[model samples]
Target: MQWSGARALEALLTVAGELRGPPLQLDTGQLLKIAKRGGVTAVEAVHAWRNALTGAPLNLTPEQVVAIASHDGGKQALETVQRLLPVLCQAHGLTPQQVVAIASHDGGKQALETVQRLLPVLCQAHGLTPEQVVAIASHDGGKQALETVQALLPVLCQAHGLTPEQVVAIASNGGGKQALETVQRLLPVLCQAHGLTPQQVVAIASNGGGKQALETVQRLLPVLCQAHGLTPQQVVAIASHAGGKQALETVQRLLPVLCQAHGLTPQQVVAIASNNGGKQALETVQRLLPVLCQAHGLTPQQVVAIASHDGGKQALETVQRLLPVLCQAHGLTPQQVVAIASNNGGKQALETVQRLLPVLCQAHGLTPEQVVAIASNGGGKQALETVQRLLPVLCQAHGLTPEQVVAIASHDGGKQALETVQRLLPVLCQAHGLTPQQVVAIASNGGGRPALESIVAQLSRPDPALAALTNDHLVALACLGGRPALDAVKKLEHHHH
Candidate 1:
């Protein structure tokens, strides 16, 4: 046994030291020996001991002494332990080891400090176990999470089955720090009302804006589900989007009336709710659904389409007020009116459609397909103007077939063609005896008026300015304009005179 750990040690029983702290004083050797026992350098053990004893609990064991020195934040943990232990831990009556376990955790130190100060009677009134307290404190962000559960759990957990297990489920998921006040008051009521398990209730609250969402949903969800006969999942899907809960109230209240009053179906309401900004669309449906009538020539599908885009809500009401008169005055089919709406845009489409498609059809024999072709291709407001200027009276005058007219109207430059035609068709056909096709073929762009001067000049080098002349004037001019035209003008003019 003599040589076991003591080679040459027996000779002098003298210890030489390798030491730090640069003190090099008489006291340094003792600390160096202590540091060796803890497996740390001389200064490391001393600094670690200072942290543990500084503001921390005095009851730490030899093992805990080292453990407190080991972790990255252990110094901060020990520093908090001393100032913290007296009233709260003693009152809670934690064991020395329990104190060490908590104090050793990185966040435990500050977490306990929060507990010491913020312990309301409502929070600790339920009497938490040290294990429970330790578990809560050891969690990262235990400060806010603790304030959350303690303040709220007793109210839910003790009276009902709600507990730290449930509230902390949410607290664990990066907060609910903000969700505390509203959810604390709300989930309890919403829980009892519709017979939801707390698990399912938490699922519903898992979306963003839980505070306002939960509050508004509580008011509307049950009333609609139980009273109005919608499915629970359906209501949740509706509520899942932006305006569902608020719209839920309107849909629940008015939905039955529409079903009874206008044959509305639940499936269709879900359709409106599921689309974009669809929830707001549902409420708009309530405002305008009843305005539809047989005489208004409306259908539910068309109503739904109007409600699809936010822009169409006003379009619905205005279309209802106006389409009937225009329909009767001009014999517009329901399908044809919808075509105007479908061309994209809302009430303005109707306003612009009202001005021309009717008169163009009734006044000039443009058929439904022809009018719709222009409106559909050119956009609603503008197509009417194109048709107005084309004056199908003249489209018929050319004996250009229906198919041919559509071809002309549908061109990329359709609007420009007619301006050229209207400006110069008579001159090309009359003064030059050129067929309508050649003159208008002269058209596709700017009615060829810039070039029509070539055709107009063909009648006479005198260039009577035939574009400005009318038929009677043209006959006299064309006759004189053709000259034998002059002799013929006098002959015809004198005989007529």
Candidate 2:
């Protein structure tokens, strides 16, 4: 009910000048005669409407335009035009034809219908491809268009800005389907003006790629592939591997062959390899390239790139081979090796080394290198701690009594702690089936401790060094709060096996 005011007058004055240039340039007497014939208010209304067709605050009625420029209320003026769009069109006060034309007046307000019309005008004026105009016009869509326009328009406008009025005028001239195609391309660029991330950009592009999963992959490959360090073949393999290593090997071999078949350059090949977890694989190739090329007449770099593209445990095998030499050269004392191979590896490197360590070391030597490799597997931390846990059991099994365990503790900073655990490892191998490994793993994570204290029970902090961990401390720490600790410890109770 809050109606528009003098904005229409302003629009009329402005548009009238554009439609009929130099409205005030005429002589005073002539102007007066013209105003008298039309009536000053009538002439003003006409002027505002035409100028609106040529100016900003687009998609507005003459009445709305006047309200916009003069109303003290902020968004109320524009809200009026929006509320009236359907009503006016239904009333024949505004036609579908006029709606499209009016909507085109501003790129920011360029609606679907207006965009449908505006493309040809752009094609004609800028001599753009039918594709290009469609690209520009189609950018205006959805509830989000205003924000998209706001971010992108300034940069685009400064570069080759489109005024609201000119845009509106151009909307009236858009070509049909040919123009729409171009508009499709512009939407993303416009949306990106709002600070969308590259990930977001690929997601949008992927949605646009439709049901062609391969096309979606293809389209997003350049973006998503940025960090993978994989060749295309390798990428496809990993993607289709469904978590299988053999499939990865196939793709590794395939990417370079495909690359060569298509005349790819060395740098491009490197890019594919670099992004697909191929760094280690590629390094392996580099090492073998001289021998491979010298022995076989095949191209060295190409063959090296191909062979090195593998992403399987083979890469792990190669890394493990070098670790012991590196360790020995660095003079890593037994304690350092224990910390790195077991403690850190205890948490993350557990699963992987558990599965593959035996197979790998059987083929290669059971050197410190293999130990380092498994320790570095990110799942080995838990396993390493498992090794540590076995130490006390190993000592006890070797006929060392608790008193002896106590003496060893005094000599080596407490038998319950990390350094003592390492120092006592040799004793575990000398004992029963290395069950100490499982114990250390549980203890290292505070898992073997009691779950919850009885309300009347005392609670104390466990030592950071774990030196205070008597059997009582272990039970109490495990049961610190309640059933949660008990539940956790229950999980490790199976270690008695």
Candidate 3:
């Protein structure tokens, strides 16, 4: 085991020279002590440590060197450090010294073994890349996190329809293990009883207070959907807000009373309860309902409609504040103000309608009343804006004319119909084998969403009549019969016979 003291000293000096200021002078007595204790291999390990700590603003003590040299596998541990230090530093954005320090934890060899064994599985199973895996493994209690991920990855993907990427996204947060377990617990109930899509489940489970939020939504969804008359989508929307737990609880408390006392329809109540400011809007509407209706002459339903947009609570406040001002400034009637405020744009349309109204009128030569009628549907302000923006384009893009746009926009659900037509016309024609003329007729009839839904349903199974039509005939059927267009074609046999 006897080896060159001079060679070790040379190695130390060579490494130290690369650092700032002066070279470190090792104690000869300490060097002799370390070499005497663990043989030449130990001295070589000490030399390797000096090289590794090179250019770092640090120096090892005689006691530190002696401890590293005398530990079991001490030389092999330093060799591990020598091998992994550069690679870990480059890959993980860790400093060389930090990488070396991690290797030395609970004895360096065991930690490296843990990292090596888990890194590849983490990447492949969860769609985690190497750097992300390192970040997780290097976190405090990170080894435990890796163990939890390993144990739960398959269960999450197989049972919950979570892709590895989704699991990784959810688990990358703090308390990831607990979050994944909570997700597993809630997925079955939410998916089956509540009919939550996988995307919606992920949305609920990935937010702050997500676990509590999920618990709150699961309890409240039944009440909200059945007792209060909300759709599953509406319940999911309210539960996906930032303060979702509080919103869910508030809606459960406020929905029944709001509907009964304020004459708000279930649709209106659900609309207000499903936005970002659900609780505040409900509270605000309860207080402002009397003023909006009594002084402003807006009915309770109108107040609810205006307040149910995405920022419904704030919209209610804005309407209350701006209703009189907008009327006086724009010479608007109370009904006109209600039309602008109650639609999807809420306050935004009220603010901009002065400018947009003139354009719609001049461009289409429609009276202000006709424009107001178009702005008051489920699509509201957004629908009006879409009509103005897309009217000419819709005619050109899908071969509808200006009269067709007006006809579609003037129907009971015309705003929604036109918006659906704008989006789905191409899809129906290109993918489902409908012609542009059929699309225009269906879109003009009721915006044709139900017709689209019916077509999707019929296509998903066998349909003899549907199987027999040319694309032109299919479009003609959809144009004439709406949702039962395909069924109409099927029943033509009975009619003909």
Candidate 4:
């Protein structure tokens, strides 16, 4: 829709330039509204209206526009409805009544917009008729949905064995591409295993989880139906939850043991499987089974809390492994170690607590808990590097924050890029309208530091002039259809009015 809108806007630009006037905004019902308030003239708009009605070449010369506009359709369309409606009919290749009925609803502007932006390309590229796209556009979200699917229609039709109508049906929601992608990945599995029609599976996917549901419908639900004795609908309900896939897998393997050994109920296990991070918690329990069993047993709520953070599960595993060492060898209380473990991850927490306790605390002139707080997010490595060293140095020297220092030193690449980005960013900010994000898009899209510097070496840059091309260039480019051709077709769009 964005590309098509760009193309249509370009074509309309040349059309207006040829007539030497203004607006898709100039004529869309807002034009009448603005004109009624009076400063707007009707004369320019009348010519722009007829300019669209005649469908002039996107980059026409004034002579060409004059020739194209010479043949008026009997008389001019006097009222806004007559002009606006016929212009829409010309752009969309649909009759004015179809345009009229669609434009009838006040919010039907979206419907008309959808039809005009999306309808022509779908018709030209995919061989779908104007009526077909218009029919899809007639429904409330149908336009939104069709716009989503038309881009992938060829693959959906031939490769996936869906008819255009079935693809359209799958896209019956407000843009079903994700739903379609989900269907593409999982549909064969649904059909082969359960004898579902594409429509049935698509309907099932869109019905609840949209993209996520069908995955668990295949991934875990087979055993669930037979061994765990769930209905298809029950499988849908359970497996379609946000965390369902991983949760269900771990739920399947260990829920039985959880019930038998710990006396937790099936309902509790289901609750754990149905929410976020349930899998992480369950996997932690699975990995450190004896840790939970032999150590002080944790409540179910505590399990989720500890396992839900960035590295929570690993944190607990490390804590459980080294807690006795911290308490007995280092003379720290189990409560202190456990509290440290809960704040961040388990493994790094206890290990740091082992290495850096009162020993490093007084050396840094900080309290033990305060030192632990410093290390919580990225652990001892980041704690020592950024918290102890980099933050104070970089924070003062470079106008960097403790947050920025920690964040920059938190990973391998952040430190790697900091020297260049830090040095270059300030001057670049004052050089016209540049920011970190602009520099980033150039570096990343321009291909990286090497790419950024390559553009720099060649930085005797163009003074931003648009290219001019003949109608023949666009005609030839559009002829290069299909997948590879479509990518090249995009470059055919005018860089100028």
Candidate number with greatest TM-score? 3
Query: lDDT (CA) for every model shown?
Result: 0.56, 0.36, 0.65, 0.51
Name the candidate, 3 or 4, with the larger lDDT value.
3
TM-score, one value per model: 0.32, 0.21, 0.46, 0.37
Prediction RMSDs, each to the true structure: 35.0, 27.1, 19.1, 24.3
- Pitting candidate 3 against candidate 4, the one with the higher TM-score is 3
Error of 3 at 296 (Å): 4.7
Write candidate 4's Cα lDDT for 29-87 as tens digits: 43333233321223243354554443432322323222222222112212223435556
Q: For candidate 3, lDDT tens digit of each residue in 241-274?
A: 6567777888888877877876777667666766
Specify the poorest-scoring 10-residue window by lDDT in model 2.
Answer: 447-456
What ranking emerges by TM-score with the best candidate at the front? 3, 4, 1, 2
lDDT of 3: 0.65
- Predict model 1's lDDT versus the native: 0.56
Q: lDDT tens digits, residues 215-315, model 2?
A: 33344344434543454443433332112222233334444554455444545444334323444444444444454345342353444333333342243
Candidate 2 vs 3: which has more lDDT? 3
* lDDT: the better of candidates 1 and 2: 1
Evaluate model 1: give its TM-score: 0.32
In model 3, which regions exceed 4 Å deviation? 1-153, 156-180, 185-209, 215-243, 249-271, 325-336, 378-401, 408-439, 445-467, 476-497
